[PDB]
């Protein structure tokens, strides 16, 4: 079961959402700016996407 997407780093946030939803269709995706601080609960249904100021993926997406 795929839980990380290192191949999405540097892609657009749009492509990342499409790809993650193909692998995990019930994913709860939240887009956040890279370099913010976030809550540290672990939610297996969630995938945060950290984007740079250009809206490309700046961190390996993972479930949690």
């Amino acid at each position: 079961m795929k839980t990380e997407w290192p191949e999405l780093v540097g892609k657009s946030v749009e492509e990342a959402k499409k790809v993650i939803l193909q692998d995990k269709p019930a994913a709860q995706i939240i887009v956040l700016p890279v370099g913010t601080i976030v809550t540290m609960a672990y939610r297996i249904d969630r995938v945060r996407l950290f984007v740079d100021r250009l809206d490309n993926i700046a961190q390996v997406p993972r479930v949690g």
């Binding site: 956040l32 370099g35 913010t36 601080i37 976030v38 540290m40 609960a41 672990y42 949690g64």
Partner: protein, 281 residues
């Protein structure tokens, strides 16, 4: 009737409660998404919001801060859950918005507020993969000023031989807390590395949620407030102990588990920590 979540028992908080110590008069800042002050199983003493578009720290639009707060300090009564330090003076220091995120300056502003308002303990169930000099300076200043600073280690799991502990947990001045389950097994998501200090329960942890609810959450976020609550119990029994002493007491009395890369010093044991003489069980 009230229920005692397994993690409160697991860290031996009831031993302190039976001695008569529950965190009275200890000020704990939950630096997080706010705390729902209308919850009947919480008593919020004060707070402040650093989130520009969410000015009320007593409204928790995310839920996470309220859950963390209930592990620190859910009230001792006939309802809901019991907190680790149910008499602590609980402060909602809102630095994260509804989406669970905040800017570094907001977190730093919250830490500065906590120092200015004489907090005894800070809990930061939060983190990110990079530090900043200003973040490091804020936590170091809090510790130099006498505050016990506790944070979640992070939920990055393993990555070979690399540390995956996040900031501010990764700073030496901060106690970074990893997560175990009820069998004392490390949770698969729990961050690892030589910066991991101690472990606490972080799997299926029941606590308070906004709108007078309860529920079970997982994460190093859930483990951290067991340690922040334990620090408050210790200070309520030993009100002159410094933060240095509180931190050593927790580190020096853990139940050792596996290799320190994965488990740090092991599971905290607040009964043993709050004795004068410390050793591991």
């Amino acid at each position: 009737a009230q229920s005692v979540p397994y993690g409160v028992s697991q860290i031996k908080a009831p031993a302190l409660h039976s001695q008569g110590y529950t965190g009275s008069n200890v000020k704990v800042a939950v630096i997080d998404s706010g705390i729902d002050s209308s919850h009947p199983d919480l008593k919020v003493a004060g707070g402040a919001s650093m989130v520009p578009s969410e000015t009320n720290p007593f409204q928790d639009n995310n839920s996470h801060g309220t859950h963390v707060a209930g592990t620190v300090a859910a009230l001792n009564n006939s309802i809901g859950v019991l907190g680790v330090a149910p008499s602590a003076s609980l402060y909602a220091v809102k630095v994260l918005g509804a989406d669970g995120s905040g800017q570094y300056s907001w977190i730093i502003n919250g830490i500065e507020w906590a120092i200015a308002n004489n907090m005894d303990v800070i809990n930061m169930s939060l983190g990110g993969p990079s530090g900043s000099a200003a973040l490091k300076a804020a936590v170091d200043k809090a510790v130099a000023s006498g505050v016990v600073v506790v944070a979640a280690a992070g939920n990055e799991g393993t990555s070979g031989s690399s540390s995956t502990v996040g900031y501010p947990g990764k700073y030496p001045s901060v106690i970074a807390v990893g997560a175990v389950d009820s069998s004392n097994q490390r949770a698969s998501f729990s961050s690892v590395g030589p910066e991991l200090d101690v472990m606490a329960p972080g799997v299926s942890i029941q606590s308070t949620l906004p709108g007078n609810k309860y529920g079970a959450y997982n994460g190093t976020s859930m483990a951290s407030p067991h340690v922040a609550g334990a620090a408050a119990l210790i200070l309520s029994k030993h009100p002159n102990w410094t933060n240095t002493q509180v931190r050593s007491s927790l580190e020096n009395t853990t139940t050792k588990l596996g290799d320190s890369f994965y488990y740090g010093k092991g599971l905290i044991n607040v009964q043993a920590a709050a004795q004068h003489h410390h050793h591991h069980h």
